[PDB]
Amino acid sequence: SNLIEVFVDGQSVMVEPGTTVLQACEKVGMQIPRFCYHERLSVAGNCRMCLVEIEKAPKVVAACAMPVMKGWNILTNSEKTKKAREGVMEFLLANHPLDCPICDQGGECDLQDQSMMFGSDRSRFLEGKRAVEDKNIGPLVKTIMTRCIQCTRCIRFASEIAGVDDLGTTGRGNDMQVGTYIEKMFMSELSGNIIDICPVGALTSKPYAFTARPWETRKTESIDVMDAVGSNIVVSTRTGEVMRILPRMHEDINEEWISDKTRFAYDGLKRQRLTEPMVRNEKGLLTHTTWEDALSRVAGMLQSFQGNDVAAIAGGLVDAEALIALKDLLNRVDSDTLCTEEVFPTAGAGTDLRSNYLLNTTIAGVEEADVVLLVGTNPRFEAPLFNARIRKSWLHNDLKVALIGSPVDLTYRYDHLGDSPKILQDIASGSHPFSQVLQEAKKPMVILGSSALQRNDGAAILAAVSNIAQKIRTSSGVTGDWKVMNILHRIASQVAALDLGYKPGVEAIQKNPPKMLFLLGADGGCITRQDLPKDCFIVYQGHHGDVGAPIADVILPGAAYTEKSATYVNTEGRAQQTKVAVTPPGLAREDWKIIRALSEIAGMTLPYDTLDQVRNRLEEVSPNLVRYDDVEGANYFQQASELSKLVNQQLLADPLVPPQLTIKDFYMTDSISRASQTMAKCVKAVTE
């Protein structure tokens, strides 16, 4: 009813009021040329490459900024429009450097490509060119600013998406320059994204420099495991080698951004790798051996133990196929001690109800909320793309954000309620004045960080935060289908492990130390040989030699997330799968196959022989684990809340202090990033 009719080259199209000319054109499959316009940034209108003729109007309009008026006929291919593009392209190239052979953008450059499609084929510029000095903005983004076309995308991204106002323009006219004025590093958890949005080779990836050309890389669409957001990515490979990581647009997750850790830690996949099975020799040293020999040693010890004598700890980057294979194997020796490194309180419902440990509102639901209460978390570093989604709501929906915990910088102003866990009881009782904010809110969102649950009083904190979300629904002020309670995870493997029925934390192992321990990519050092009997047989399966491997009796080289097709579930409970970009190095093998092979040598053959069959198994345990890209809702918050009150645990007096307080703590948090030379440069850069 509100729609108005406009014409694109005579074709009628119905558009909402406020639609720009450029957006009207894309509704009929026309992409207007652009440089300064990005649909996730504020409109700028300065490059003028989008100028388009409106029938009967003498002046061309900037399609990216001009709202379309009813009855307009947009002439996207008329003579006036074509000559406008040729003129603007000519001005863009007048001072641009003859750099294409040495410029990393070459082959995937919007300036090159729109010059070929919309520009002239020659030059009439007979003068000398501008040259601009380079700015150093850190170890990640290389600047060759003579290539800059002054589109200001980087400036807008930095201010709007990253919430950092360190980039700007200095000077005037032809000598206007983009930079920081002073010498200053642009180090943000989202900084690497300015490489993608810069249309030219002015901003390029320092680690990637000179290594490849775009036409020769193979693209593998996969998932990021550096956190629990499940950012969609593309793995660029060439001749069997991973060359870089790029974002893959998923509007409900990472819209088209990734964090610097997701972008640049891939080089850690080339260091400290486990390539061969190893066993201890007569001198107690790890020495390479065959797969046959290594698995025979493990199978013998496995066949001689039962029940609590066998335990396993799953690390942060473990996939669901390996998680269920290991669970099935220890279950066949009647062991149920399947543990994760990351704690989650088993009080009350525990992991009985998915809604107890999921981000129930979903990441996209943040854009619908009106108040967000962050509790004991620093989402900026725990879930950078989740925090970016908060700032988007803060910027566009006037979202009100409050934090209970340390007063960290979140790139947007928020109301700090303090760090004491007692504020939760104040809010639940109604004493705190913020309880009146939640009471009025129609779509509140209470977010508790998984990092807060690692405290000893975690069960109390979860109960306290659960009580608040319970009263908000008792006020009946929420719609009904709207969910208030949310857990924000930081570990890629955590949600899948809870779904499969693992025991969160390693409390069980500490209670009943096993005689045989499987470390499945576990590198948190939660359990060391000091906590185990003197003869404990430790088997380490993983892809990096880091913390777990040096203490193991037997080492089984596994595959990294770029080397297998494996299932991961993000903090929302959304199951996603990776694809093989390259095969594992050396003798390393797919993780679920190692356990499947081990089960046969131990005379306990598991009932699945292919990837499809192990995923049929995953469906028998938790059907949502094979619903790829789907978000299956979880209900029964009432039942969980009732159980959480049955046992009262007191809150510790310690303030809520996030593990990552500053940018220096963000870069290294797992085996892959700890092995990355790029992440080491970032840490050195921000601490010096």
């Binding site: 190239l93 007048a94 641009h96 450097p97 003859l98 294409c100 052979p101 070459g106 082959g107 300036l111 090159q112 490509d113 010059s115 070929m116 520009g119 002239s120 084929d121 020659r122 030059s123 510029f125 050309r213 036409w215």
Partner: protein, 77 residues
């Protein structure tokens, strides 16, 4: 430019190997006849279409002009 040169088409009468042999020999003679006209009527000018979106620019242009370098880069990749 074949419409601009003069030459005769040899035609056989028996459709056998000997006539096809004679046609080929006579076609060689007519080829020399055409070559003579090509040498005399060769005009001046450029040798490839002056459209750098199809034919690569001259190397000197490629090394001086931004548009020419872009088009050289894209035509050869």
């Amino acid at each position: 430019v074949y419409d601009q040169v003069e030459f005769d088409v040899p035609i056989g009468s028996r459709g056998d190997c000997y006539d096809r042999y004679l046609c080929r020999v006579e076609e060689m003679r007519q080829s020399i006849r055409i070559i003579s006209q090509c040498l005399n009527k060769m005009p001046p000018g450029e040798i490839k279409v002056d459209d750098a979106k199809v034919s690569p620019p001259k190397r000197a242009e490629m090394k001086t002009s931004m548009e020419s370098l872009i088009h050289h880069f894209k035509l050869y990749t």
